[PDB]
């Protein structure tokens, strides 16, 4: 049942925000959902795997998300941005790669809610990680040069 898989993955994605270690048991079943016909389920599975995964899996999973960014709705793009925010908290050493990805998404087409969620994520990374501050402020300065909002 697609609805039951969706409900389970969405709930696991919320658990993975608070208790990522508990969800790690489900990682094998979540990997099978990465190729689901429902792109919403696949996106929730990847974003859950990002929250629960190892630092070594980040570059592989980020590369898979970048291929789905064109096929997913803006609501699911916001869920991807929230997963990146949680990744920056968990793996502060990867902030430069994650900020460059967020900055690339900021240059692409997107609605107000999606652009807001990216800006909010960059601001959160700047507040939590002082080493990211100058780079994040520089990316926000480039964004305001062509900001429609």
């Amino acid at each position: 049942k697609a609805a039951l898989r969706y409900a389970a993955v969405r709930t696991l994605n919320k658990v993975a925000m608070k208790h990522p270690s508990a969800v790690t048991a489900c990682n094998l079943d979540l990997e099978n959902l990465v190729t689901d016909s429902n792109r919403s389920i696949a996106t929730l599975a990847i974003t859950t795997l990002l929250k629960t995964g190892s630092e070594s899996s980040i570059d592989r999973l980020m590369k898979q998300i970048s291929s789905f960014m064109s096929e997913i709705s803006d609501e699911f793009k916001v869920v991807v941005v929230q997963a990146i925010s949680a990744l920056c908290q968990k793996y502060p050493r990867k902030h430069a790669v994650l900020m460059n990805f967020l900055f690339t998404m900021l240059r692409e087409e997107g609605g107000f809610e999606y652009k807001r969620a990216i800006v909010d994520c960059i601001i959160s990374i700047i507040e939590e990680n002082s080493e990211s501050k100058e780079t994040g402020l520089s990316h926000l300065c480039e964004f305001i040069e062509d900001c429609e909002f």
Binding site: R107, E108, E109, D146, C147, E148, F149
Partner: peptide
């Protein structure tokens, strides 16, 4: 150095 800008202002101008 050639870039296509896809800002909300450029979309609204193109739609106008």
């Amino acid at each position: 150095g050639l870039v296509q800008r896809r800002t909300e202002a450029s979309r609204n101008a193109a739609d106008k």
